Structure formats: structure tokens, C-alpha cells
Amino acid sequence: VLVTGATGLLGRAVHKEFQQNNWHAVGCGFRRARPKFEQVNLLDSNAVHHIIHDFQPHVIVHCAAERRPDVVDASGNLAKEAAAVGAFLIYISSDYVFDGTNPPYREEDIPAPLNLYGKTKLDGEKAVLENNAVLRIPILYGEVEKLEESAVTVMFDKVQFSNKSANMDHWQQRFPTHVKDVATVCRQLAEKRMLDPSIKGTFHWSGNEQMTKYEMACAIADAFNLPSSHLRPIQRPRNAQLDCSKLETLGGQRTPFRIGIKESLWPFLIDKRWRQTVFH
Amino acid sequence: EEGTFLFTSESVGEGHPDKICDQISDAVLDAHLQQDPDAKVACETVAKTGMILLAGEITSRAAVDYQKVVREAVKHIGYDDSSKGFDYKTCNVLVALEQQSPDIAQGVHLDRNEEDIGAGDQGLMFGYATDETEECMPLTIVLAHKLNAKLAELRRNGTLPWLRPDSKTQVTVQYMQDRGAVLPIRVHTIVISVQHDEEVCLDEMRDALKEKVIKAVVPAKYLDEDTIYHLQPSGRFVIGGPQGDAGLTGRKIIVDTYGGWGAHGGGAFSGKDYTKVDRSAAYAARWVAKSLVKGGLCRRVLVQVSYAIGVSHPLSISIFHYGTSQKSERELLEIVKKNFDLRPGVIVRDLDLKKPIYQRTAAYGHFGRDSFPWEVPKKLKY
Amino acid sequence: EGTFLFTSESVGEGHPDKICDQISDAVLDAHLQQDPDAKVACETVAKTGMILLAGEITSRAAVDYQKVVREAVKHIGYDDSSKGFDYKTCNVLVALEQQSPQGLMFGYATDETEECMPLTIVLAHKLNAKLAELRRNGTLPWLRPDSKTQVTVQYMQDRGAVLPIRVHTIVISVQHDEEVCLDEMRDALKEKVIKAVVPAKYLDEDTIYHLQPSGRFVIGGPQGDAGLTGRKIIVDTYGGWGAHGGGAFSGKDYTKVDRSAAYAARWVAKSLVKGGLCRRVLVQVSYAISHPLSISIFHYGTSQKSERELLEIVKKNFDLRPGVIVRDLDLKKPIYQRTAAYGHFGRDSFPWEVPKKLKY
Amino acid sequence: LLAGEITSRAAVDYQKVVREAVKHIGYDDSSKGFDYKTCNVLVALEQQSP
Numbered sequence A: 001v002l003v004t005g006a007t008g009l010l011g012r013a014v015h016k017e018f019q020q021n022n023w024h025a026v027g028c029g030f031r032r033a034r035p036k037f038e039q040v041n042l043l044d045s046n047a048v049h050h051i052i053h054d055f056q057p058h059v060i061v062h063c064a065a066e067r068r069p070d071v072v073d074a075s076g077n078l079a080k081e082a083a084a085v086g087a088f089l090i091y092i093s094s095d096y097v098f099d100g101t102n103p104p105y106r107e108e109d110i111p112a113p114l115n116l117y118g119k120t121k122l123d124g125e126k127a128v129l130e131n132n133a134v135l136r137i138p139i140l141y142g143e144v145e146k147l148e149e150s151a152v153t154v155m156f157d158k159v160q161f162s163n164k165s166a167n168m169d170h171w172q173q174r175f176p177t178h179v180k181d182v183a184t185v186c187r188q189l190a191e192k193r194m195l196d197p198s199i200k201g202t203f204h205w206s207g208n209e210q211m212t213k214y215e216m217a218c219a220i221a222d223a224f225n226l227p228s229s230h231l232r233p234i235q236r237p238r239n240a241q242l243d244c245s246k247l248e249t250l251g252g253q254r255t256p257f258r259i260g261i262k263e264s265l266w267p268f269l270i271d272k273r274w275r276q277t278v279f280h
Numbered sequence B: 001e002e003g004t005f006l007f008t009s010e011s012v013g014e015g016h017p018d019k020i021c022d023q024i025s026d027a028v029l030d031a032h033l034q035q036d037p038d039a040k041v042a043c044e045t046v047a048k049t050g051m052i053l054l055a056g057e058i059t060s061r062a063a064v065d066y067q068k069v070v071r072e073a074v075k076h077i078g079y080d081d082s083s084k085g086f087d088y089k090t091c092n093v094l095v096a097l098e099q100q101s102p103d104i105a106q107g108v109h110l111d112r113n114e115e116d117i118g119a120g121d122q123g124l125m126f127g128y129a130t131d132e133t134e135e136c137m138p139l140t141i142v143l144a145h146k147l148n149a150k151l152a153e154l155r156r157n158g159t160l161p162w163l164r165p166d167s168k169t170q171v172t173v174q175y176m177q178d179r180g181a182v183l184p185i186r187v188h189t190i191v192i193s194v195q196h197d198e199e200v201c202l203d204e205m206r207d208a209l210k211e212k213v214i215k216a217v218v219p220a221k222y223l224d225e226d227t228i229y230h231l232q233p234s235g236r237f238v239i240g241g242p243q244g245d246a247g248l249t250g251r252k253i254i255v256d257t258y259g260g261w262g263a264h265g266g267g268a269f270s271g272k273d274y275t276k277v278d279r280s281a282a283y284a285a286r287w288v289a290k291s292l293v294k295g296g297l298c299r300r301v302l303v304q305v306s307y308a309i310g311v312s313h314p315l316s317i318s319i320f321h322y323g324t325s326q327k328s329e330r331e332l333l334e335i336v337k338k339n340f341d342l343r344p345g346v347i348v349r350d351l352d353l354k355k356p357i358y359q360r361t362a363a364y365g366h367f368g369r370d371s372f373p374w375e376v377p378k379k380l381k382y
Numbered sequence C: 001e002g003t004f005l006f007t008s009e010s011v012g013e014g015h016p017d018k019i020c021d022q023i024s025d026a027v028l029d030a031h032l033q034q035d036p037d038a039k040v041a042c043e044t045v046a047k048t049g050m051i052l053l054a055g056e057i058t059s060r061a062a063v064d065y066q067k068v069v070r071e072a073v074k075h076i077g078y079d080d081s082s083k084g085f086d087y088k089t090c091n092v093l094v095a096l097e098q099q100s101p102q103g104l105m106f107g108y109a110t111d112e113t114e115e116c117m118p119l120t121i122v123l124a125h126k127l128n129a130k131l132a133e134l135r136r137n138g139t140l141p142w143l144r145p146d147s148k149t150q151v152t153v154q155y156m157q158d159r160g161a162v163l164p165i166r167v168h169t170i171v172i173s174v175q176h177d178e179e180v181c182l183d184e185m186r187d188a189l190k191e192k193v194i195k196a197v198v199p200a201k202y203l204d205e206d207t208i209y210h211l212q213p214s215g216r217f218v219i220g221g222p223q224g225d226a227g228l229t230g231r232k233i234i235v236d237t238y239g240g241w242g243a244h245g246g247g248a249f250s251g252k253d254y255t256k257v258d259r260s261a262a263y264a265a266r267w268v269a270k271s272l273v274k275g276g277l278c279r280r281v282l283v284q285v286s287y288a289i290s291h292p293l294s295i296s297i298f299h300y301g302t303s304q305k306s307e308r309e310l311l312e313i314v315k316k317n318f319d320l321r322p323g324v325i326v327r328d329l330d331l332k333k334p335i336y337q338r339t340a341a342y343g344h345f346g347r348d349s350f351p352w353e354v355p356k357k358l359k360y
Numbered sequence D: 001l002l003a004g005e006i007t008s009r010a011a012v013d014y015q016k017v018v019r020e021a022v023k024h025i026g027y028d029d030s031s032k033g034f035d036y037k038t039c040n041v042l043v044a045l046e047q048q049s050p
């Protein structure tokens, strides 16, 4: 039960989800991993080697961490030694692989992205797949420690401050997905594969709510009973919806956005932030 | 850097003279309670070279041998020989105890129903709670206490028979702010000084402290290679406790509570019965704070209450949740009003404050400890 | 509203613990006035007819402990047995051990009063002072030295700062003679003490008054309640506001960092507020086993500048090495006895209470 | 405990006098009932100096 990027929004969700429900879970990350997670750098080869060859993991989850641009990696190392011990790797990936024209993009569809973050995700999939899962996901939100941990949560300030108006992108259709919903999906693709092989090949998950930046902003405002009138609608895929078929075909989890984003963003309410000092 | 900050809390052993006094004071409270549950007790204690002085006011149907009680407590602490700087067998015990003032008695508890008895004093009191540990206490103060507790346990066990009772522990932790909550990262520094016999070499003690004390108490997660260890700094400490020093009841109020976190209203616990709200309301306030954290209404909370003498009800109640709750601070206040009744006449029953086990509270903190009634969270109905 | 209440208390000079603090610092003074480098840890204990002095002293001075003690008790007002205590006839016991030849500390300041102190404690302090003044006046001749006050203020949250709105509740208990009646006393405390100390704007018809709530306070001073040095540390400081690490002030000399660095930390905190750099602030100082290892500044979001920026501003205006602190604050001079009542902070007379103009 | 009235110019260390006398007498350990090293020494002498 090893989780990478366990200090990130996604990884903290994964580790939580396993450990509470009948697993001995152990996460890791480069930046500031201790005290809650055994510290490990991915690009340090002997470090990666030690903990895997020392822990005896049933399953591994490589989480691609941090968001916000919206404008490198060799993950092959992992698969070599992931499979070396009796366990299978789940490489998390992004909808920034398809062009965003013929939705809903299928598991077996052919990818065609553009520039930074586009194909740079495929090279990791190549490296993982060759030498022996690839669970793609859309834009993520969740219970963030800082607003910049999610491309959804950064907007919250702009939603609150009416005094200055801002413009939100209505161009790009997306499916904001609670990392916690992904956390369970990941627990389900592991809970079963150990019993029912041979579950691998490229996979797709996503929530069922279609939204744009502007609609997400107004969804957030209306969740907190706030004024949204100051919001203004106006190389990336137009709509790369993820055809969530295979894992849905088996039999996932879905948290309604208006409840999940409210649960996640209440601690960043202006009034609460003022109150968040060490001493009264 | 990130929102990182250092914070230190300290604790002391039973041999520290301030805590010797606290312990004695509570030993006299326990002695009185055993025969008179309604004993009025305000017993201050003073320790000095060769001397224990009891001073204060007690009204009790109990009959108590102050000599025995004082000397027996000094025995339990472990000062039994001139070589240790103090001996219960041969020390000076002086007693300056009078009756509680009638003017207070009439104005507080005379001819009144238990529920209507006024606070025994004016005062202000705080309760604090924090999800950074299972005990809902600051890690800094929890480690500080436990370290001293480990030392005396090992002393009594015979595993370290070169230890004496006086000890002081400081614990510094590197903390991260988290949306009003606080997160401990690592133990920055541990300082340990403890009294010892003349026979042992410095390097055996420092070895024992690290391997046999610190590692038994502090989780490996919090320790690392940059963690600074000052064990027995400046050598010496062969003599300790009251000898060449002076100590009093009520001079470790911060050590007794939250190691610098939360807040404090000045009032000292030891030597006082439940009608002294410095203690009873403070225990109550902690019970409230913890109940809110364990009940999931917040991650961190500070509670204030105040009282006037001869008045049953709190003059004021205040809740600060450090923006760690979805509910407003006024919502929490409202929840507190309908689940708690903080008159000393009612708290005594809720927390059972006539039992003679106050001497157990006189060291290693009054809060965050198993089997204390104020540590058992009340389920809230809202 | 988004309002809240907060309470702080104070005590008079005749309160037994505060007696003990005053003597402890009168002792200190008497030593320093003879010996600038005298080391002092003087505990004072008070109970019916007894002042016990205890602790450790390294000094070249020879002090008449009996004159020191009796003069303090005279000053405080305990000059007859009918008042429970008399400097003329009391017992002075000395157990001091003379010879001849690491820690958090907190400063706090708030712009809610001119004195940069929480309004709660400021009013509580001042209430006790009007009592002593009026007792010595002979305006209220039935007054006696032992007293306690408590102020609860209703506050507003305002962007990290705290905004006093009104005085919600006031408690005054004061020792009195056997002549005066209860109604007269209560009528006097409200009209002559409270209305002379609390600004009118904060007093309304819903303000609750617990005046002589005990009903009788004739027995008092050490007779009423044992007193000890160092048992009013929150009254000495911030009245539940800010923070406190645990050390008593009174009876220690400047070489005790519990005192001298605490005074400095306030000095800094009060400089920042009076420099308009922050509406309110708490200053932390970890000293290590030299300059202070770590310093945190919590400006409560009430400063346009960052914490690092405020730190730098602190570094180039303040020397916080114990040695330098005593020079800057003139701590070798023997007038600590004036600190031991009415709180150590919030009075212009003290070096640490005079804000240093900041150049940054 | 030392009690009584003294009028004099000397500055006596009552610590040393009391402790050194008790040492001479031979009370130096708790097993013996009394010890010059650890005993309380209380002074209520009322002294002046004309």
C-alpha cells in the first residue's frame, strides 16, 4: 500500500481512503513528507528501491501532483520495481492528451494534444505501459490546504471579492472531479485486481457534472449564497470529456459538486481566514 | 519560508520545589476530602532548605495530621536522605492554617442549595483543545510531561537507580499553521536536566536519557538527525529540590495547563476545593473545549468563562474556534449554553470534584490525561 | 452581530499576593540601590500577622529587611489590627540564603487603548487605583487596602483587530470597615469609582454591576487569604490576552530573563503599534542555550507588511541581547516596587512603555 | 530559629554561624536526626545600629 505524491491533494485523499478501510497504508513525497509520510524522492533511484524492497507493498499508486497552469519525468523506474514485487502500478494521467473535438473520448482512442503538459503525459504512459494501469482523470478539486492546490479552488478569492470584477473562461468544458471520488475508484481497482486479473490497459474516470470555469464560479457562489454578478463570461482541448466506460462497466463513486466544493472551500471564507491565527 | 513557527513548552518533575508544594497542597486537600467531602480548603505550601510551611485557610470536619501528610508526600516524591538535599524523616514542618473567613463563608456557601452556591471568588478561566494529538493537547506540553513521567517511573522501577526526583524538561517543536489548526512537524529541540547521585559518569546519563527515556516517549516520526539534544547541559545537578532553592504552590500554572498555548486567567489549582472556581471552572472549561474538538465541531478552540464571588452563574462565556469550524463562533456558544451548566454547584456533580485524587493532578499536567473526568468528552445535543 | 465578550481582572495593593509582590520588589530595590549587580530570587509569603521572606540572594549589600517590609506594609495601608494587619506589630521572618561574591517570552500590544493594552485589564487596573486614591484622599474613609476588580468588555471583530463597544459587566469587591452600610458602599463604587474611571460612552443602562457581591468584606488582607509572590502573573501582564510562558516578575533581578526579556518583548510590541506598522501584534522570542534564536511576529492580519518585513524592522531597531536590554531599559536602577501593583504594562512611566521611533 | 533584640554595627552571616556551630557539635547527617548542611535557619532578630 504505497502512495506517491501523498503530500499532494490527490495523494492525501488516496492514503486516507485505503488506511481507514482495512489497509496498512504508507504514503511518501519529496517536499515536506514527514511527520505523516516516509519521505522519498522519485528521481532518486536507490531511495525508491529501498522502501519498495523494504515495505512489501500489495499495491502502488503513482499520483501526478499539483495544478494551476493551464498554459521532465521518467516514471518507468517505478513499473520495473513495482512489478518486481507482487503488486501492480496505477499511473494517474490527464485528459490533456486528446484534442478535445470528438467527445466522449474513448479508452482506446488515439491521443493528439499540444505543447507543455500535452504529450508529456504520454511519455510517462509509454514508459509505464511498456515493461508493464493508466487511470486518466479530468481537472481535480478536493479538500485543499491551500487554494492553489486545485485549479478549481484558486477561483474562490475572485468569487468573494465583488469590489473588483473578474472574467471567467466559458470556453473550456470540464468535469470537476473530487479527488476523494478518485480515491475510492483507486481503492476499487486494487481491491478487485488482486482477485480478478488481468486488469490493465488505459482507463478513464470522471464525475458526471459538466461545467466551465464561469459555471464553477457561479456554482460556488450559489453554494455559499454569494453574489456572482461581478463575474464575466468570455492550445488546450475545447472539450475532452473522458468516456468513463470500463470501470463504470464493471461497477465508482460520485459526490455532487455543490456539496463537495462547499465542504472543501468553507475554511477559505474571508471571515474564517481572519480568525485563523495561532493566538486569539 | 512557509508559515512555520517554533514553540516550546516545559515540564518539571515531582522534585522541583514549586511542584513539591503543589503536590503537598493537594495531599492536604485529599486528606481533608477523605473525611469531609465538603471541606473548604485553600492550602498554600512553601518549600525551602529543610522546611515545608503550610499556610492558608481550611474549614473541615476532618481531623488531619499535617506532619504525617506532609512527610508522607515528601517520601512518595523520594527525598529521604541528606545526600539528596532533603529528608522527610528530619525536615522542618511548620503549620499556619486558620479557618476560612466567615465573610467568605456567608457570601459563598452558607444556607444555600448546592446548585445555588456562588463562585468562591471572582476570576476568569480558559479551556483549550487541539486535534494535533489524541489527548487534544499541544504536542510540546504532552512530550514535556511524559518525559518527566518516564524519568520518575524508571527511577522507581530501579532501571535507573542513580536518578533523584528533581527534573526539568523543555520541548520545542516546529509547527505549521493549517487553516486555523496547528500541525507539529518535528521536535526541534529537547532539553533534559535531572538530579542524580554522585557515582555516575556524565556520558552514561546522556546515553540513558536518549536511548532509555527520549526514544520511549517521543515518536520516531518527530525525531530526526537535525533534532538538537542538550542532555544534562552544564553537568552538575548532583544536589537538587528544595536545598539551596525556594518553591511555592501556584508557580507552575502554565506547566500545569497548556504549556503556553491557549490562554490562562492566572488562577492556580493545587490546594483548593471545588468552590474555588480557579480550579473547578478551569476543569469545566477544558471539558467544554475537548468536547467540541472530539465532537467534530472544530479542530482547535479556546473557551473563556468568568465569575463573580457569591454568584452561581458565569458572568460571561466566550468561544474562539480560530476559524476551524464551519459553524460561527456564536453558534458554538449557543451549543455550549444548552449542553453545559457551569455553576460550581453543578460542575462538582458533573466532574465529581469531591474525590480525594487531586494529588494525582499535581504533576505531569492537569489535562490530556486518562481517567480524569474533565478528559471524558460529553456527547452534545444540537 | 459578530460581537463577543472578554473579561480580565485586577487587584488592589492590599490583596495578599500583591502585597507579596511589592515586598519582593522592595527587597530587590533595597539591594540594587546599594549593589547594582545584586542577584535576587526573593519569594514573599503573607498570612495573618506574618511576612516571611524566602529565597536566594547574592549581594554585597546589607539590607535592613525589617524596615523594608514594614515600610511597604505601611505604604499599602495596613497600619492597624482593626484592619486585619499592622506593619507596627507584624512578624517578619527571614529565611533568605545570602552570599557575598532556554525559554519563550511574549510581548503584546493593541491599539484599542491609548496605553496600548486590552481595555479589559486597563479598566480593571484603573478601578483598583481610584479605590486606593480615594482611600488615601479620605474621600471614602471606610475603604481598606484589599480589593479586586473585574471588567467584561463587549468587543467587535474588525479585520484582525478588536473594537471595544461597551462595558458589559463590572465587578468590584473591596475590604471595608464595620461602620458603612451596603447601599452606601454600592452607591459610592458606581458613582465615585466606576463613573470616574470608565469613559461615559462605554457605560449604558444595560451595563451589569456586581458591587460588593460577597455582601461583607470586613475580614481581608493576609488575614482573609494567604498571599504569595508570583501568583498574579496574568494581572501583571495582559489579562488573558496575548500569551504567557510562565515566569513571575517580582523578586527577580534583571539577570533573570523571565523579567527583562518580557519587558523588552512588550517594548517591541508597543513600538510596532505606535509606529502604525500594525493595529495589534504578539511578539514571540525563543532564547537558546547570544541573540534570541527564533522570533515570530503575529500581526493578526492587521499589518500591510509581511511578518518577515516586520522582523527586519525589528532587527535594525532593537538589540535583544540580555546584556544590551538592561542598558537600553536602565534595569539596574532600583524602582521595581512601582511595577508590582497595577500591572507591569500600560503605564508611561516605564522605559519599556516609551515607544522607540523606528527607522526602516 | 533565632529570635531577640540586637543593637550593633556588625554584619553577621547568621547562615555560617548557625551552620558552623551545628557542624562542630557533630550534626552532619539525616541518619543522626539533624544536619548542618540541610537544616532550615530562620531569623527574626530585630536589629538596629546607632
Ligand SMILES: C[S@@+](CC[C@H](N)C(=O)[O-])C[C@H]1O[C@@H](n2cnc3c(N)ncnc32)[C@H](O)[C@@H]1O
Residues within 6 Å of the ligand: B042, B057, B100, B101, B103, B104, B107, B120, B121, B122, B276, B309, C015, C016, C017, C146, C147, C148, C173, C174, C214, C215, C216, C217, C218, C219, C220, C221, C224, C225, C226
Ligand atoms: C475569595 S478570597 C479567598 C480565597 C479562598 N476562597 C480562601 O478561602 O482563602 C481571595 C481574594 O478575594 C478577596 N476577598 C477576601 N475576602 C473576601 C470577602 N469576604 N468578600 C469578597 N472578596 C474577598 C481578597 O482579595 C482575597 O485575596
Ligand SMILES: [Mg+2]
Residues within 6 Å of the ligand: B017, B018, B019, B021, B022, B248, B249, B250, B251, B252, B253
Ligand atoms: Mg507550583
